[PDB]
Design a protein around this ligand. Structure first.
Ligand code: 402
Ligand code: 402
Ligand code: SF4
Ligand code: SF4
Ligand code: SF4
Ligand code: SF4
Ligand code: SF4
Ligand code: SF4
Ligand code: ZN
Ligand code: ZN
Lengths: 626, 626
């Protein structure tokens, strides 16, 4: 969109007269007259500087590419003549917030959008080559590329430059100048500007005050730094749990921002945008709008999303019910293969819904990848169902539906960016919007959840049970799994559906269940330190468990890194959020995941039953050692 | 090709009269009249049985798919009426040597080849759907698929069945009947019939006599079994070193066979087929044709390949020279970063040319993946150069060149099948032919290397030096690296280019070099047990090394699993092969890899220098933990 700011008529009206058009990261894009004695930095100052005081990165010359200016030309006087022939007297300014891969992808999209009509008709000859460049760059931005694709890009740039008779080629100059950025993108899977939402790493920005709170809160000691000076996160060992983000008092820890992508997706005509809301979002987002912690404002969130333009507002608790339907069956199978089976079974089964815990177990303790449940997280279950069933039966391909996840978690971005959750470069979750980002969007759009009217959530993939809503707090996943599993194992319905002992706030909680003729020993872990301790206990064998639920954040997803900062006592606020989830559970007529009519309909119409072939193919995934 | 055995006229001439056409795995394909009382097994017996006494797997009904028969119908009488309408009275027989994925890929290729002309014109509507099925099946056969692709195939089969008004769909029935085979292909990356050359696992066949030689020779204790009964290889922990294959007296250990693929590729018109020959092949293939071990018959091999139809006969020793040019520069860089540098450097550098050793270090000791050289093996260096430079400059795309590697190694098939060595599903090495397979091809084609005339190897990618030819025997890689590196480090040329101490037959050999003002401590390992021992010593720190060359086979590639079985004393025969390689080295005017004119031309024209950006992108790769 940065390449369509100025029209061709108003660009060509600047053929002579020293007036130039300026866009990009300038505060006030427009057409200004550069004075006689003026440098590039003085031009930027005449434009009002850059968006967020970011340093200058590069500057494209003309809508038809005419080279990049760099920091070496920043202090030098602006030399004319760079607008040699058939190039508009315009500059697109790049700051340290611009990824060169994303910039070139946008440039190729702009070229293709011109070729689709009469403009830039001579570019039809290089259409296939620029399309292949776009595919390679998309693979780079998705982290599914290789080093040899740079050589392929070199060859493509050579081919396009020769047959276009152009003295500057954007691919060739990008390889020459930002090779370090391209190499970082490919080898490190890291986008240092965080524009590639699939390559986002937690980076401490320059506004760090060096208080050490992030270092203290880090469970894996991934953060190095000293008092009163900037800290650094080792993204290689980072689990993306987001504890540092919550602990940071100055919001110096960034993990990307898909707000711009979400706004463009909503404003794009004929683009179907659907959203799924995590359980913990509805009990924390109201604190910014004047609600007490634990108040259920999911109706207000749905109304705000629909006002923003979301076509379908759904709930991740539906996917939570589906995940429980899979996981309880898996637990029953592994329990039957333990009593009447043999040693080939693996116990305890571990919840796989937390992506930070999955990343932790894939990085450290890589030999335990077959212990956690193969079932996908509720977000990914919902996403794959929506892409493969709901959209298919309403006549939309996977590329025609934009599935946005509203999550309280930093690591949900990484989970959505994982390659196995994608088909033909189309990911099941297009991107993740945090609770903080949604709060900012609502505030900037004038939406106030306190006074907005109530709106219903779409029922086809938004209907959920109290077992599915308790996911957002610690112990809820295992409580729902127990609710669904023990009732079918014993044959009778429990009078008290709430299982005490699984609840509480201890770092690790042990519960023993005596229902029926089978005894289940259940563990719950709050943080990644507790997860590591219980993994060590599992390896030692000093204590035994039948099923363990693991969370990366203290208190569950209500304490997630994407949640708004709490007020007063953090423990009290998190407990209030958990109690709000419990009240939502108590207010629901259906409190068992297997009673969910929509999930049952999915099973009877599309799959066959939990742990069937189709159920495995869609709702189950695999892990990879790191 | 199995679907084009009978013409449409001779298939439709069997409309009535009980005569049926039979092809597939039958010994004598043709048209026979089934008697009144006859079962499917009796029909197969009337056809002469199956090719290699393999068990019956399935039977396709009609060239237009009309269902699969299975073992349950094998003992039952052949029921007519299965040729309902618009289907030829023919059966294609599948044995236990037929992969269902390959069979369906061939069926879709046959359908597309019909659609390209007037026949099967009504199938044009499902062309895109069957093409997507073919792409999914190709991804499955290449090991780059997922479980959800089975759900995609289900949807595609539903779509094609409905709009074709067909009562049998091959994709739907394959999912129903061979789901276990499909699941094995996807999850285990294993083709139990070994038809998918990218998913080949070493499998002990039924002709095992249980002598235990494979179990004794296995370095990682991967083989289980008892005396006088069949043994089994745990392909998950298998390193593909091929020691068991060499030790097997009855050839019961199979690792696939690309002979049929090679023959079809050679017989295909307008198909450019090129070959690269490993150094160890030329000193061992003559033993089967009446030459003493160590005799250089590369001229005879080139003549035989050209008679078979190979368009370009090249040498892997050229890629060995290129690999030395990269590796000596890398060793120099890491040595300079050790003396004048700091602890961030990693020593000793380990050779990465052996794929079995690479698989061993990726499976066990997964934290050491950054220790071995990032440089590709000579085979992959040659393959990527041929695909990206030679073919590009002679006007051939990567899909128009069939690059065949003639190797003495089982693990070379796995290396060629690795996904990182491919672009857009086109692998740099299309497939690997072993020395035994080439011997069988020559014998079956009437080619006798003893009396065939001499022919020159193509010089553009076949010219090589004595440093490149010694690769095939133990210590040769490190000897060539030393030859290229020490001369540039010291500035003067050595009078004696052969480095003693690196040669010999000890399991682990330690050599200390005092040339110049720098001292290099070099280790060489024969087998994977020695490699594991030296890894343990490296971790302990009891001894230090500067560079270590690792081989998986005793004696180097001359003792590779794909080599013909030796006669007399195995040690004496392997030493004779090594001495033959040494004599070839001594007979060459150029004995340093950096003197190779073709490699130098590649560096000055296409790359820039060793360890440049383009050199890294093309000739360097990465490893993945398992
Ligand atoms: N996927 C998923 Fe979860 C669900 O349902 C929601 O989205 Fe959590 C919340 N709230 C988050 O973030 S993830 C871990 N399991 C417990 S809750
Ligand atoms: N790649 C490669 Fe090798 C080379 O050159 C050849 O092909 Fe070997 C042989 N002979 C094999 O097999 S691999 C290991 N390094 C030594 S030699
Ligand atoms: S995210 Fe969790 S792991 Fe990564 S730095 Fe912040 S605290 Fe440490
Ligand atoms: S918490 Fe925020 S401010 Fe305090 S040190 Fe860590 S990053 Fe810098
Ligand atoms: S606990 Fe919930 S919030 Fe914290 S990381 Fe795991 S999933 Fe995201
Ligand atoms: S190949 Fe090497 S590793 Fe695999 S079984 Fe034969 S001997 Fe053991
Ligand atoms: S060597 Fe061949 S025959 Fe002897 S046991 Fe191993 S596999 Fe069976
Ligand atoms: S040594 Fe040569 S033959 Fe034996 S495995 Fe390694 S590469 Fe293949
Ligand atoms: Zn990026
Ligand atoms: Zn197969």
């Amino acid at each position: 969109s940065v390449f369509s700011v100025f029209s061709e008529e108003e660009l060509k009206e600047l053929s002579n007269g020293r007036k130039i058009a300026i866009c990009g990261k300038v505060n006030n894009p427009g057409i200004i007259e550069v004075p006689e004695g003026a440098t590039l930095n003085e031009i930027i100052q005449l434009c009002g500087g850059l968006i967020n005081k970011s340093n200058f990165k590069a500057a494209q010359i003309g809508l038809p590419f005419g080279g990049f200016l760099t920091e070496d030309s920043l202090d030098k006087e602006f030399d004319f003549g760079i607008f040699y022939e058939n190039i508009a007297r315009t500059i697109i300014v790049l700051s340290q917030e611009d990824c060169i891969i994303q910039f070139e992808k946008f440039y190729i999209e702009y070229l293709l959008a011109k070729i689709k009509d009469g403009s830039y008709k001579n570019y039809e000859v290089v259409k296939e080559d620029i399309t292949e460049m776009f595919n390679i760059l998309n693979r780079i931005s998705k982290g599914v590329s290789n080093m040899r694709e740079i050589y392929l890009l070199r060859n493509l740039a050579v081919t396009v430059k020769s047959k276009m008779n152009q003295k500057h080629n954007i691919m060739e100059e990008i390889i020459d100048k930002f090779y370090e950025e391209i190499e970082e993108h490919i080898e490190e899977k890291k986008c240092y500007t965080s524009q590639c939402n699939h390559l986002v790493k937690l980076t401490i920005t320059k506004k760090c005050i060096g208080c050490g709170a992030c270092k203290r809160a880090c469970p894996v000691d991934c953060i190095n730094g000293e008092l009163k000076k900037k800290h650094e996160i080792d993204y290689n060992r980072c689990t993306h749990c987001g504890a540092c983000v919550s602990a940071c008092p100055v919001d110096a820890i960034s993990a990307g921002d898909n707000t711009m992508l979400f706004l463009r997706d909503l404003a794009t005509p004929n683009k179907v945008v659907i959203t799924q809301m995590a359980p913990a979002v509805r009990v924390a987002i109201g604190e910014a709008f004047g609600f007490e912690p634990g108040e259920n404002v999911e109706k207000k969130i749905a109304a705000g999303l629909r006002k923003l333009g979301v076509d379908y507002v759904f709930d991740t608790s539906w996917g939570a019910d589906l995940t429980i339907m899979e996981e309880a069956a898996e637990l029953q199978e592994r329990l039957e293969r333990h009593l009447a089976g043999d040693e080939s079974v693996k116990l305890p089964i571990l919840t796989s819904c937390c992506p930070s815990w999955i990343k932790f177990i894939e990085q450290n303790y890589g030999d335990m990848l077959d212990v956690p449940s193969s079932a996908k997280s509720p977000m990914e279950m919902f996403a794959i169902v929506a892409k493969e069933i709901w959209a298919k039966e309403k006549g939309l391909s996977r590329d025609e539906v934009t599935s946005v996840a509203i999550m309280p978690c930093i690591a949900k971005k990484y989970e959505a960016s994982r390659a196995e959750f994608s088909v033909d470069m189309n990911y099941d979750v297009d991107y993740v919007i945090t609770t903080r980002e949604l709060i900012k969007i609502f505030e900037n759009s004038g939406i106030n959840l306190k006074e907005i009217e109530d709106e219903e959530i779409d029922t086809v993939m938004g209907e959920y049970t109290g077992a599915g809503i308790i996911f957002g707090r610690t112990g809820g996943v295992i409580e729902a799994a127990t609710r669904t599993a023990l009732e079918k194992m014993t044959g009778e319905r429990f009078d008290n559906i709430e299982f005490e002992g699984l609840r509480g706030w201890d770092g690790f909680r042990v519960c023993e269940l005596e229902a029926g003729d089978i005894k289940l020993r259940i563990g719950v872990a709050h943080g990644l330190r507790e997860a590591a301790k219980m993994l060590d206990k599992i390896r030692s064998g000093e204590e035994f468990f039948h099923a363990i639920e693991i969370m990366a954040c203290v208190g569950g997803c209500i304490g997630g890194g994407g949640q708004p900062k709490t007020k007063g006592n953090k423990q009290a606020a998190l407990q209030k959020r958990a109690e709000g989830l419990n009240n939502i559970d108590r207010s629901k007529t259906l409190r068992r995941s297997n009673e969910n009519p929509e999930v049952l309909a999915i099973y009877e119409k599309y799959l066959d039953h939990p742990l069937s072939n189709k159920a495995h193919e869609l709702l189950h995934t695999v892990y990879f050692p790191r």
